[PDB]
Ligand binder design. Sequence first.
Ligand SMILES: *C(=N)[C@H](C[C@@H]1CCNC1=O)NC(=O)[C@H](CC1CC1)NC(=O)c1cc2c(OC)cccc2[nH]1
Ligand SMILES: *C(=N)[C@H](C[C@@H]1CCNC1=O)NC(=O)[C@H](CC1CC1)NC(=O)c1cc2c(OC)cccc2[nH]1
Ligand code: NA
Lengths: 304, 301
Amino acid sequence: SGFRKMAFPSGKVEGCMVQVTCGTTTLNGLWLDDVVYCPRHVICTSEDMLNPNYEDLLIRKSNHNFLVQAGNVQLRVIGHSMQNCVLKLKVDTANPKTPKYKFVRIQPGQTFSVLACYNGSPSGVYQCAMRPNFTIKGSFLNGSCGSVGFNIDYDCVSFCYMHHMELPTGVHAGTDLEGNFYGPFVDRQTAQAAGTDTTITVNVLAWLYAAVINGDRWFLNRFTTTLNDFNLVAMKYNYEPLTQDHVDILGPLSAQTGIAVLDMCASLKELLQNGMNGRTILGSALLEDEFTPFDVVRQCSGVT
Amino acid sequence: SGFRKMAFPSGKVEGCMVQVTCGTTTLNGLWLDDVVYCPRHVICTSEDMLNPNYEDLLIRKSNHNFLVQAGNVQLRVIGHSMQNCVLKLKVDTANPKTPKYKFVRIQPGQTFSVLACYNGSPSGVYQCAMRPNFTIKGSFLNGSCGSVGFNIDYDCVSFCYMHHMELPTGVHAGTDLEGNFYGPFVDRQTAQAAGTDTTITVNVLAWLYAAVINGDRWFLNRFTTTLNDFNLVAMKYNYEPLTQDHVDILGPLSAQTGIAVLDMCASLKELLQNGMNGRTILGSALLEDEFTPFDVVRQCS
Ligand SMILES: *C(=N)[C@H](C[C@@H]1CCNC1=O)NC(=O)[C@H](CC1CC1)NC(=O)c1cc2c(OC)cccc2[nH]1
Ligand SMILES: *C(=N)[C@H](C[C@@H]1CCNC1=O)NC(=O)[C@H](CC1CC1)NC(=O)c1cc2c(OC)cccc2[nH]1
Ligand code: NA
């Protein structure tokens, strides 16, 4: 037992982190097969960052302008291209540590592990959630761009995030592995504001199911509600609306505890309208929203 | 910026996890060089677990009773011995993925990363602290015994923990890699209670410095306290006392933020006496004590 914010084992991703340098700018890249993926602003200097014309800047670069390094070992760049905000550098060596992998674009509310790297060296790993406003409350410093977030299913690594930016409020922004930003953010040296954040409702429900599994069930009530009425109230309490996918992935926890999704939604609606009244859930007095139903299933059943 | 519970990258440890089976019991082992380390209760049956005479049980086993598996590859056991609660199985193959490593015993208040594994397959990694009562607030299920905790210094892995047991309260217990339990716990199948736990004060102070570095400073005040008066109040609230060494290691964070240590201690004393008033610090409604000063420095610099 015990419930912890848990990250995936990072070895498979560690085996793929490299160091990409253009001129004096050094950030991190992802070496899969014979291709290295990294943020394109590696080709920028400071004066270019303020308003960059990445096409014009890339036409001026050649293969021999890119220094790719695994450790201190150079990988020769034999091709280069730009896909949205991601630079793809074809190298001369296929990574022998390439795992089975996919590129996926996650939805707001999903979690993933971030491998914080600097100069191609992994420094840390932590668990993160894509907020409803398409930011992440990560932990990044200078030189962390190109660090990736990922999940692992069986032995297959699904890469979903590449880091690019820190907003003035201290949250972070990035793209998928196809270079498309999450949210309305652009890779420019500008102070950009995110929309107002909200609470991830499906994750709070997953946490309440985790409570019921461990005996904590004072918050259950008689009532049920329709999905639409619940979403209407939830938006009034700065909670995200619940999608059909959300109801579907809550299915296993509903079957394990015997509590239907809409019944638990009525329980949470009562919690939002009346409060907690001093009482606690899993010790905590705050409702936790960065555990997905998958995370609860993973820690309350064991997976891989 | 930002602050998260961060674990060390686990790849070097993943390269060493194997599956150890004796009879019907299967748990995890650590394969370093030509030796596999695992919890000794792998040799016990449900009958033995109540009051196991481990040396009698071990002398009755042979090399061929132990099935060591690296993924889908059998490792032939050519020796076996016992160091306290840890069984050491000598195999015929040296692990090529063996990193530079050390066996260390950590003190209460220190943190480490846990690689939770089942049947030799790593499933998760998270950050833990050795509680003052020598438990850890981990996340372990059946078959997780043999999972290890560790830190990493440049490229050297310091193994400090091997998991053995879950207490009735849901906290966890284990040994160092020399087989000596942390705390008054025993590897037998009984309900075992821990001593009263206290809060790691120096860690709370480091985490308040982390909160100041990341903008949160509603809890600060214009007051200052002496070390002894702060320790009086802290012990009143079941907090471990703050030593001069603790004050010194907070030095870098004090220099970075410009807040003296005793100034922050006045802030924390006000927090303990008054409460949070519904407010939060770094998204937490409770005072966090599982970040050492070094963890904060490493993350905020
Ligand atoms: C990549 N190495 C780096 C990582 C940042 C720095 C601190 N922690 C992080 O997460 N990324 C950047 O520095 C990016 C680069 C631009 C292409 C996006 N810039 C920012 O994150 C950035 C720039 C500003 C700014 O510029 C005037 C004003 C306010 C905030 C801000 N953030
Ligand atoms: C190892 N695979 C396993 C890991 C446990 C199971 C549940 N989660 C964990 O962390 N360890 C055990 O099962 C140990 C074995 C000990 C003999 C060394 N046993 C316990 O943790 C245990 C036994 C009891 C008990 O027995 C009557 C009563 C209450 C609690 C308890 N915990
Ligand atoms: Na003060």
